[PDB]
Design a protein around this nucleic acid. Structure first.
Lengths: 291, 56, 95, 147, 54
RNA sequence: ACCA
RNA sequence: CUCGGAGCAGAACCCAACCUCCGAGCAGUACAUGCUAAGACUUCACCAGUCAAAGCGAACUACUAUACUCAAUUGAUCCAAU
């Protein structure tokens, strides 16, 4: 009601918009400065003799011969091995809750990397050495949704917030190839390769993922009841019985350790053109993909 | 350069912690035994000279 | 500096800088102090302690170290158990 | 469903079953119903929140009677007019972690009372001033003229 | 004294604390040249990790 | 013994 | 040819000279000359250099002490030895 319509009706009485009466937005096209005329010619902004006017001053960091600042500081391994450190995109319980409240992540089904990427909840960069998402606690007080969520790292307080609401959380490892596939399935399927096996963690990560306190995906299921009970005592909530819930079957869904996608096995070829799936039946191949 | 009176020597903890420290002593003096604070065990213990680091 | 590489037409990082300085995402650079491992026998404990600090660079040095490193070295990282993680963002800083 | 040689069924053969991980162990120390938990946003200059756990120490039955007596002494200054033992934590911005500290204090008061440590602790600086001030107050104590 | 406040005076026992002024810090600079890394801890409000938009 |  | 003290340069600071003078490239005591941390100084940049409450450990009842006397008494990075 106003300026909006006031512009289109103001256009009715103006000459036709053509290729002859266009112009850039004021302030968008700064003028070029050319070395011509009194102000900008003559020495042309370059000063008088020396190295600078002749374009031959030394490189960046050189100080005229004094041992330069960036060389006289001692080497220290601030950045040593930076390229082999694993990084985890943090997912907040504020951001997770927001994604569910806006309908971009569906809590009625299991939530793994594919659902978070497809809901545009996190952006994963395996080429920048991302190893998955770390579930961080920020927003734990106001988190109410019950989810079955699979991440790579999770804080105890983040786990408590999930499990206090009746949800389930498991931590699962993805190797960089498996991670790239799980993050963008369609581009991988357009390679026409059999679905590979998800590799195991490296040794240094085997203790994390075989530990029930982290809800590790290689951890002993019989040890989970105790660990879930400990956080409830620690943080002062009553552990719900999720076996009594109607979504209990959904809450129990976990990929096999060697499995990248729910419902698809290693060694299958997805034929998106014909909407078919090709399964090998050769024994040697079949033994390879189940091992 | 030729003149030399003192030397730098390493004093290792007798507490077995592996803690070491450096002190100067007269070259002609005898090997040093000292009571020095050892942070690993958090108490003063004996240290014995082991090696001359350099000449001062 | 290499402003344009012969193979990629790209500016190159001065690797001397990477081996000596830490870039925090906020744009601060952290160095060790020169001489913190030299002739400790003649330095007082107060001086030795000063020499062991990790210290910040001034604006001029920061601007210089920014120009000698490419964009990769300014990205936010999410290293697990990064000792410097809390130092990447500023708090209560006015002007 | 796909299963590989690393199925949890195969890795932990004795832990099979869908409920194994989700059973509630049958074998109730601190009853949360018996506590009054309250949450305030302390000064929110403070980013940290504040949790408050209060329960009537006398009525408390989950605490052994002797302990309830001993606690009432060593924490007199935490008992209000009504007899409620009040505990507060504000060392976290998360109510979970403040309540966890509140409950751990309750859980500590009990353990401390039952142990009854007789070890001679090192004298604090502030105590030394009181001991001397206390010693020189029983030095001015007189007697009755006619005993 | 608690008995006096509770019984005789019929009131709650008032409790006081000796509160010291907050410590002084100079105004935070964008570039704290030559200050130790913990200079940032002097102007921090919380010890727990933050995450911003994430 | 004597590289930086 | 580096570093200190004095004059020039009288009184906050700074101040040149193939200017005027005099010095230093150590000794001695310790063996907590251990740790840690507010706030500051600063040789006109930087680098380097300096002083320090509180705290932790110690020490402890009559100048000493969580930072020895002393003016300088000194050498970055890389690299090497371990």
């Amino acid at each position: 009601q106003g300026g909006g319509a006031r512009a289109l009706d103001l256009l009715r009485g103006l000459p036709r918009v053509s290729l002859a009466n266009l112009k850039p937005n004021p302030g968008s096209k700064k003028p070029e400065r050319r070395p011509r005329g009194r102000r900008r010619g003559r020495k042309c902004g370059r000063g008088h003799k020396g190295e600078r006017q002749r374009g031959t001053r030394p490189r960046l960091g050189f100080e005229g011969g004094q041992t330069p600042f960036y060389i006289r500081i001692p080497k220290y391994g601030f950045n040593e091995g930076h390229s082999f450190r694993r990084q985890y995109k943090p997912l907040s319980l504020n951001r997770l809750q927001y994604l569910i409240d806006l309908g971009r992540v569906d809590p009625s089904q299991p939530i793994d990397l594919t659902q978070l990427v497809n809901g545009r909840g996190v952006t994963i960069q395996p080429l920048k050495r991302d190893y998955g998402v770390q579930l961080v606690e920020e927003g734990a007080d106001t988190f109410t949704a019950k989810v079955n969520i699979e991440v790579q790292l999770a804080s105890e307080l983040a786990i408590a917030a999930i499990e206090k609401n009746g949800g389930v959380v498991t931590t699962a490892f993805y190797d960089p190839r498996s991670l790239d596939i799980v993050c963008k399935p369609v581009p991988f399927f357009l390679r026409g390769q059999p679905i590979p096996k998800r590799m195991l963690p490296p040794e240094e990560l085997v203790p994390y993922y075989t530990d029930a306190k982290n809800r590790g995906y290689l951890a002993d299921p019989a040890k989970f009841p105790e660990a879930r009970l400990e956080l409830a005592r620690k943080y002062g909530y009553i552990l719900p019985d999720i076996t009594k819930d109607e979504l209990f079957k959904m809450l129990c869904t976990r990929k096999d350790p060697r499995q990248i996608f729910f419902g698809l096995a290693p060694g299958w070829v997805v034929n998106m053109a014909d909407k078919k799936i090709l399964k090998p039946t050769d024994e040697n191949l079949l033994k390879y993909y189940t091992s | 350069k030729s003149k030399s009176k003192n030397i730098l020597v390493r004093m290792v903890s007798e507490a077995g912690t592996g803690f070491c420290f450096n002190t100067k002593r007269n070259r002609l003096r005898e090997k040093l035994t000292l009571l020095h604070y050892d942070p690993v065990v958090k108490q003063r213990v004996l240290f014995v000279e082991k090696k001359k680091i350099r000449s001062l | 500096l290499t402003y344009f590489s012969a193979r990629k037409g790209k500016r190159k990082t001065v690797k001397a800088v990477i081996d000596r300085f830490l870039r925090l995402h906020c744009g601060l650079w952290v160095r060790r102090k020169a001489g913190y491992k030299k002739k400790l026998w003649k330095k007082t404990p107060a001086r030795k302690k000063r020499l062991r600090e990790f210290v910040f660079c001034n604006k001029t040095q920061s601007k210089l170290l920014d120009k000698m490193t490419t964009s990769f070295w300014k990205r936010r990282n999410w290293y697990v158990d990064d000792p410097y993680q809390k130092y990447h963002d500023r708090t209560n800083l006015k002007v | 469903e796909f299963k590989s040689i690393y199925s949890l069924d195969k890795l932990y053969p004795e832990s099979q079953g869908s409920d194994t991980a989700w059973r509630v162990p049958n074998g109730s120390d601190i009853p949360l119903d018996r506590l009054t938990i309250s949450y305030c946003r302390s000064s929110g200059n403070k980013v940290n929140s504040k949790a408050e756990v209060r329960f009537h120490l006398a009525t408390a039955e989950w605490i052994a009677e002797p302990v309830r007596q001993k606690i009432a002494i060593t924490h007199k200054n935490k008992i209000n007019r009504l007899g409620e033992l009040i505990l507060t934590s504000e060392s976290s911005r998360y109510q979970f972690r403040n309540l966890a500290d509140c409950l751990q204090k309750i859980r500590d008061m009990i353990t401390e009372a039952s142990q009854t440590p007789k070890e001679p602790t090192k004298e604090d600086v502030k105590l030394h001033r009181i001991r001397i001030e206390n010693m020189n107050r029983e030095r001015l104590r007189q007697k009755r003229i006619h005993s | 004294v608690t008995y006096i406040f509770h019984q005789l005076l019929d009131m709650r026992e008032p409790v006081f604390e000796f509160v010291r002024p907050p410590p002084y810090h100079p105004k935070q600079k964008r570039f704290p040249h030559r200050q130790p890394l913990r200079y940032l801890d002097r102007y921090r409000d919380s010890h727990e990790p933050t995450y911003g938009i994430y």
